[PDB]
Amino acid sequence: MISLIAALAVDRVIGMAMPWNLPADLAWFKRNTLNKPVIMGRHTWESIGRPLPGRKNIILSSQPGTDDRVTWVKSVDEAIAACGDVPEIMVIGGGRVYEQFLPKAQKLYLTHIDAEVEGDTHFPDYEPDDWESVFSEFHDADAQNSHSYCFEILERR
Numbered sequence: 001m002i003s004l005i006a007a008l009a010v011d012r013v014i015g016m017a018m019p020w021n022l023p024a025d026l027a028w029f030k031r032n033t034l035n036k037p038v039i040m041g042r043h044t045w046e047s048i049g050r051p052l053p054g055r056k057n058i059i060l061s062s063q064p065g066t067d068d069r070v071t072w073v074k075s076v077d078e079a080i081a082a083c084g085d086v087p088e089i090m091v092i093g094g095g096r097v098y099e100q101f102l103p104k105a106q107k108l109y110l111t112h113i114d115a116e117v118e119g120d121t122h123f124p125d126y127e128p129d130d131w132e133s134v135f136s137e138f139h140d141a142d143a144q145n146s147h148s149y150c151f152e153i154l155e156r157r
């Protein structure tokens with residue numbers, strides 16, 4: 001089962017380009033991806049800098065791999081197969097990779113951040129008749145979190 005996990009600014013802007021400081025969102029991301037395979041695009045891999053620990057890291061790119069610490073694939077179907085038989089595969093972006101996996105996804109984990117950010121890459125426009133919000137948790141900005149944030153889980157319907 002494929003899930004997407006993303007942090008979205010106002011108007012669904014993604015944002016590689018690091019507009020906020022949300023330690024609570026990083027903990028949410030870690031909690032929801034721990035011990036699951038993660039699929040990412042190459043610019044997201046370069047941003048992270050080093051493999052996410054305790055997780056098979058799969059990079060989807062059309063060009064040959066340049067780091068033996070991660071697994072490199074060239075297609076969606078190869079990326080899924082490289083995950084093996086796990087209960088849940090986590091797709092961690094960026095925008096093009098989210099579009100590649102959205103039609104197969106059954107679950108979205110979204111953090112909505114009340115930040116206006118000039119990026120031009122948007123999360124795909126998921127519609128109500130395909131996606132039922134099943135969990136939401138709102139937080140105000142505080143001394144350790146720069147902006148308000150809202151954790152949402154949606155399930156395909």
Ligand SMILES: Nc1nc(=O)c2nc(CNc3ccc(C(=O)N[C@@H](CCC(=O)O)C(=O)O)cc3)cnc2[nH]1
Nearest residue numbers: 005006007025026029030044048052053092093111
């Ligand atoms: N909700 C959410 N928040 C994000 O920041 C996020 N980021 C990406 C991809 N970008 C990144 C960038 C850094 C790390 C990262 O360094 N994660 C660490 C957290 C603490 C640490 O640095 O060790 C991890 O272990 O998961 C993950 C994803 C994709 N979906 C997201 N989804």
Ligand SMILES: [Mn+2]
Nearest residue numbers: 016043044094
């Ligand atoms: Mn890019």
Ligand SMILES: [Mn+2]
Nearest residue numbers: 010114115116
């Ligand atoms: Mn605002």
Ligand SMILES: [Mn+2]
Nearest residue numbers: 129130156157
């Ligand atoms: Mn339906």
